[PDB]
């Protein structure tokens, strides 16, 4: 699933079957398992994918097509092809989001009063995904979901068969990529509160390099996800962590500025902020993970 392009890839055996009373025969065999060059001499339905972007039909080594004619006139026509379909995603809970990628197909040039589609078996058992058939690295296929409907176009009504594959993004990559460095940078920023107040360049470079780390983190984590125009969950996490790091630096600036005039106040604000920051960060972590894991 290419998240940056809002699309997915799927390799399928696409099977169609209809009844053609002009292809009745009577011979010793009851089924003719013919070639893939006989299917061009006869009528075959012109199914196209409503949300397919650039699909291919494999031609290696011969055209990967299949034509079977049964003695009573039934035709089975199978193709092997790679659909590259469009999956509109709502990345509001990224990277803890679930999707339903569709695959709509129907008939081009044949309205509902001419060609209708139907599933050959029970609708729950028609689209079948293989067991070892998963090239997903970032998602997890949960199941499939078929449907059938009618769309009203400028040229007539068309039967449209929809198939939804339900996907759930795996967070294990993004944890180590973004959620662990941000938390570690927040901890590295908060560890500055334990140094003595007489070493001001030390705590300064602590704060400033944590701010630098958070900025480079937000940039590196934003360049993975496509350029959406809203805030995801990872964006909110990075924003709150940046707020915590920057607030820590502001607390250090306050402690240093209050030194040499009121030492007791600086001591108080360094002792109070030594425990309020991990407490606040832990409550934020608890609330954030609770609202985005049960979402």
């Amino acid at each position: 699933v290419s998240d940056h392009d809002m699309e997915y890839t799927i390799d399928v055996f696409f099977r169609q079957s209809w009844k053609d009373e002009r292809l009745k025969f009577k011979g010793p065999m009851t089924v003719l398992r013919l070639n893939n060059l006989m299917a061009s001499k006869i009528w075959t339905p012109d199914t196209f994918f409503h949300n397919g972007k650039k699909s291919v039909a494999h031609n290696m080594t011969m055209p990967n097509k299949l034509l079977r004619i049964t003695e009573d006139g039934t035709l089975l026509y199978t193709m092997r092809l790679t659909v590259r379909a469009e999956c509109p995603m709502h990345l509001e809970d990224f990277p803890m989001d679930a999707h339903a990628c569709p695959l709509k197909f129907g008939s081009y040039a044949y309205t509902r009063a001419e060609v209708v589609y139907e599933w050959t078996r029970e609708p729950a058992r028609s689209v079948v995904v293989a067991e070892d058939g998963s090239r997903l690295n970032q998602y997890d296929l949960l199941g499939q979901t078929v449907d059938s409907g009618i769309v009203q176009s400028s040229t007539g009504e068309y039967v449209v068969m929809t198939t939804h594959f339900h996907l759930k993004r795996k967070i294990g990559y993004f944890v180590i990529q973004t959620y662990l460095p941000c938390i570690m940078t927040v901890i590295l920023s908060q560890v500055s509160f334990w140094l003595n107040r007489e070493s001001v360049p030390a705590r300064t470079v602590f704060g400033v390099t944590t701010v630098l780390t958070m900025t480079t983190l937000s940039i590196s984590a934003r360049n993975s996800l496509p350029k959406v125009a809203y805030a995801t969950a990872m964006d909110w996490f990075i924003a709150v962590c940046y707020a915590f790091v920057f607030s820590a630096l502001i607390e250090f600036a306050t402690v240093n500025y209050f030194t040499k005039s009121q030492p007791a106040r600086a001591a108080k604000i360094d002792r109070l902020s030594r425990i309020a920051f991990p407490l606040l960060f832990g409550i934020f972590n608890l609330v954030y993970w609770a609202t985005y894991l049960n979402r």
Partner: antibody
Amino acid sequence: VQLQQSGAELVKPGASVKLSCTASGFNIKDTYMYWVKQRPEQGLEWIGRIDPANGDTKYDPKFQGKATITTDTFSNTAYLQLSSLTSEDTAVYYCARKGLRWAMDYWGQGTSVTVST
Amino acid sequence: NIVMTQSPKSMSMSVGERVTLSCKASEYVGTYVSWYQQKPEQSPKLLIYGASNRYTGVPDRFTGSGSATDFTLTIGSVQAEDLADYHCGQSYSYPTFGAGTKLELK
């Protein structure tokens, strides 16, 4: 177009019954054939279905092992055989075929089996 | 086994008024819910095939409304010949029907 079933049966509990459903107006190799049961003043219950062009059959979990559905293509007939029927399956047995949006558009006429001594 | 729950189990209503029957599914059934009508001592008749598609020979007073789980069958001007049973059945998986609803007159 039309499905015609056989008459009612009055059998003894512990025997086997074979019900028939003859199709007129279409070839049964193009659709599925369903058997449904309906008790007096209750809802329908799906027994099982058979794909006559293949022979593949599926059954309801409360009917697996009890009923068996076969087909005769040369005369367009679907058969339902119940193996050992007890004193509770006194219902009406309908024969249906799949329709447009996987609905049962054409139904039979019902065959009311009756078990008693 | 997808269970279809139909409500109400029995109802009465007069002539020439809108009436609505509901069917609720446990699992997802896309648009594969069908509505059958069964008069006493007769075989069921398909009224609505799929969610919101009328069968050939059904009056324009029956209309269905579909969703992922919630389905309705609405009759407009209900006549005196609609004294029958109405079943909802799903076809997304191996077919299961509802319990039934007995329409009555008053």
